[PDB]
Amino acid sequence: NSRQEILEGARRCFAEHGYEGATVRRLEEATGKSRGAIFHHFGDKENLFLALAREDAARMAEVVSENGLVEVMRGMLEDPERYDWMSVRLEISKQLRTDPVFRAKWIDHQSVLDEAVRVRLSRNVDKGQMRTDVPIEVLHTFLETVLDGFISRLATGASTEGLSEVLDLVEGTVRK
Amino acid sequence: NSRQEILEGARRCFAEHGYEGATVRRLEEATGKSRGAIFHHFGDKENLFLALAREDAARMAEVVSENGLVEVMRGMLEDPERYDWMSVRLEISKQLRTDPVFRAKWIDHQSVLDEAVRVRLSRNVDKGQMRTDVPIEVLHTFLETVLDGFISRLATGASTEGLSEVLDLVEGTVRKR
Ligand SMILES: [Mg+2]
Ligand SMILES: [Mg+2]
Ligand code: NA
């Protein structure tokens, strides 16, 4: 409960203020919980952020298991209210490249999504639905690159125009 | 001449420190030019950023005219440091999305690139090289989304392995069958 309350409020706070602007005082205000309770549950601000990213990964992993990364992207188009949170995620990009400890933690906190993508694509291969003239890992990297592009695009304020059709094309490309 | 100097230092500074981290001191360090030289020129950090965006849009536009957005991306793989500063978009996305003035400036400063992509795709269509079962504007948006993906991956230190083969696949997809 307390943990949940902290996560729901923290997501709002980060989205509203950005990473640096999500001060401890603002996190208190957004959660109704003390700094002592927040850090008791999460240790530090970065771990709190990582918990949120892991929540994202779990949710995305579920959708992937149903209908792939393309369906995650379709959901992005349905959810414009989430763009502010997507922007916060993007702010940690440089740290991801330069801080080995944080990097490893970020990767670990995405592990459920990464595996789900792999399982999905395996299932698709088993069913003979993917093209076989291109290795499955090239197809994998292609889908991940489109996903990163979608996130960037939307977060930076590009319109929705033609994106559903772009997703149709993306799906068509990896199929037989 | 000096101006190419100030943009060159800015580029390296943005690549190294980010947008917020590009302090006057660090910009001086990178340009070795007194804050007065640097900003007399541009007024503020936003405008130095937008000037750089224009300069590199123009370079990309040249490449596009020769061999499309895919060739821009092949070049990014060949030397990721050239456009590494573009990582700053990932830092400032909410400002680019939510400040309509800034956003309009950003779009304007990329106009030469956008027109070159449109001219290149037109030429491809004229020669019957593009698939025609998907509208050309969907193909256009696809290619841009891929480029946005490439900038993100390189910003976060993703391996570039398999990406040349990904570009082959991208190129094959927009072509006729
Ligand atoms: Mg699908
Ligand atoms: Mg080509
Ligand atoms: Na052109």
UniProtKB/Swiss-Prot annotation, chain A:
Phenotype upon gene inactivation: Deletion of acnR leads to a 5-fold increase of the aconitase activity. Overexpression of acnR leads to a 2-fold decrease of the aconitase activity.
Pfam families with a match to the protein in the record: TetR_N
UniProt-annotated binding residues for Mg(2+): 171
DNA-binding region (UniProt annotation): 23-42
Chain positions recorded as citrate binding sites: 69-70, 120, 124, 175
Resulting phenotype, residue 56 to A: No effect on DNA binding
Domain HTH tetR-type: 1-60
Any one GO biological process: regulation of DNA-templated transcription
MF (Gene Ontology): DNA binding; DNA-binding transcription factor activity; magnesium ion binding; transcription cis-regulatory region binding
Keywords: DNA-binding, Magnesium, Metal-binding, Repressor, Transcription, Transcription regulation
Alphabetized InterPro entries for the sequence: Homeodomain-like_sf, HTH-type_TetR-like_transc_reg, HTH_TetR, Tet_transcr_reg_TetR-rel_C_sf
Subunit structure: Homodimer.
PANTHER family, per the entry: HTH-TYPE TRANSCRIPTIONAL REGULATOR RUTR (PTHR30055), HTH-TYPE TRANSCRIPTIONAL REPRESSOR RV1474C (PTHR30055:SF229)
Role of this protein: AcnR negatively controls the expression of the aconitase gene acn. Binds to the imperfect inverted repeat in the acn promoter region.
Name of the molecule in the record: HTH-type transcriptional repressor AcnR
UniProtKB/Swiss-Prot annotation, chain B:
Keyword Transport: no
InterPro entries: Homeodomain-like_sf, HTH-type_TetR-like_transc_reg, HTH_TetR, Tet_transcr_reg_TetR-rel_C_sf
Effect of loss of the gene: Deletion of acnR leads to a 5-fold increase of the aconitase activity. Overexpression of acnR leads to a 2-fold decrease of the aconitase activity.
Listed Gene3D superfamilies: Tetracycline Repressor, domain 2
Result after altering residue 45 to A: DNA binding affinity is almost completely abolished. Still forms a dimer but the ratio of aggregated to dimeric protein is significantly higher
GO biological process, one term: regulation of DNA-templated transcription
Residue stretches spanning the membrane: none
Residues reported to bind Mg(2+): 171
Keywords, sorted A to Z: DNA-binding, Magnesium, Metal-binding, Repressor, Transcription, Transcription regulation
Keyword DNA-binding: yes
Residue ranges annotated for the HTH tetR-type domain, each copy included: 1-60
Effect on the protein of changing residue 33 to A: DNA binding affinity is almost completely abolished. Still forms a dimer
UniProt DNA-binding region: 23-42
GO molecular function, a single term: magnesium ion binding
Record Pfam families: TetR_N (PF00440)
Consequence of changing residue 131 to A: No effect on DNA binding
Record note on what altering residue 133 to A does: No effect on DNA binding
Residues bound to citrate: 69-70, 120, 124, 175
Coiled coil: none
Superkingdom assignment: Bacteria
Function text: AcnR negatively controls the expression of the aconitase gene acn. Binds to the imperfect inverted repeat in the acn promoter region.
Subunit-level organization: Homodimer.
PANTHER family: HTH-TYPE TRANSCRIPTIONAL REGULATOR RUTR, HTH-TYPE TRANSCRIPTIONAL REPRESSOR RV1474C
Protein name: HTH-type transcriptional repressor AcnR
Phylogenetic placement of the source organism: Bacteria, Bacillati, Actinomycetota, Actinomycetes, Mycobacteriales
Gene coding for it: acnR
